């Protein structure tokens, strides 16, 4: 019954309790009500150190929740630059699309995270990708009237 307790520890940033649950054979890929893995919740709440520990212990870097979001989706949208690079260097799909067709580039662009958009572009983010509504990251920046982001995406 340890998987439920590792999920709580990952979201809560309990760096020490994550280690103890890991050594005692807790499932590093447990799912909660929303289909989140511990790596999902650690990226969502910006816990960089717990993210690395979960990766060392074999967490699925591209696990999808009930809506098809990967941990890189959540880290890119919340603006956690440190976590985005750790996820990329460990084999995260930079062009993963969830159930509504959104990529990490879409989610970072929607919240105006310039530095994260530039890192994603460097790692081969597809600027022509569209969600199910036909929108690119450029379209999103125009809808939100973000001129600085538009310039980034225009080159």
């Amino acid at each position: 019954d340890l998987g439920k307790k590792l999920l709580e520890a990952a979201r809560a940033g309990q760096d020490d309790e994550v280690r103890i649950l890991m050594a005692n054979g807790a499932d590093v890929n447990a799912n909660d009500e929303y289909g989140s893995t511990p790596l999902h919740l650690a990226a969502l709440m910006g816990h960089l150190e717990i993210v690395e520990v979960l990766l060392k212990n074999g967490a699925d870097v591209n696990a999808e929740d009930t809506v098809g979001d990967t941990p890189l989706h959540l880290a890119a949208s919340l603006g956690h630059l440190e976590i985005v690079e750790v996820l990329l260097k460990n084999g995260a799909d930079v062009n993963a699309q969830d159930f509504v067709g959104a990529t990490p580039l879409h989610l970072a662009a929607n919240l105006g995270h310039l530095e994260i958009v530039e890192v994603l572009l460097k790692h081969g983010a597809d600027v022509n990708a569209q969600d199910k509504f036909g929108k690119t990251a450029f379209d999103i920046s125009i809808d939100n009237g973000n001129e600085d982001l538009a310039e980034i995406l225009q080159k």
């Binding site: 969502l44 809808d143 939100n144």
Partner: protein, 127 residues
């Protein structure tokens, strides 16, 4: 209709969601994003026969009447939660959170917004 983030923030502000019970506006924009991806047309049938309608995915077992589910606590047909005007969904949403348990009734907010910087969802919008 699919809202833009800032467009929906401005519309939610007009409908009384930046001054409601301490639930700051960013909470609502974040919740609509993970409920419906800003799509007022979103409809998802639940495993129990009920259906979630609209931009805040209001459930048809308890809060509206769809003729194929009889509580209708928002006194509204579920079809009325699907128009490009968000008045119906907002007024019904205000009734859902005001029972006492609050925003924790919002599954998408609880799993994806609660504990994050919700003010980011209105960041960069000229309101």
């Amino acid at each position: 209709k699919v809202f833009g983030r800032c467009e929906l923030a401005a519309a939610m502000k007009r409908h009384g969601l930046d001054n409601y019970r301490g639930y700051s506006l960013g909470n609502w924009v974040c919740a609509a994003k993970f409920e419906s991806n800003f799509n007022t047309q979103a409809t998802n049938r639940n495993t129990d026969g009920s259906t979630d309608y609209g931009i805040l995915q209001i459930n048809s077992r308890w809060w509206c009447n769809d003729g194929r589910t009889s509580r209708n606590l928002c006194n509204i047909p579920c079809s009325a939660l699907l128009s490009s005007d968000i008045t119906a969904s907002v007024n019904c949403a205000k009734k859902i959170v005001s029972d006492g348990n609050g925003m924790n009734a919002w599954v998408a907010w609880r799993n994806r917004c609660k504990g994050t910087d919700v003010q980011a969802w209105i960041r960069g919008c000229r309101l």
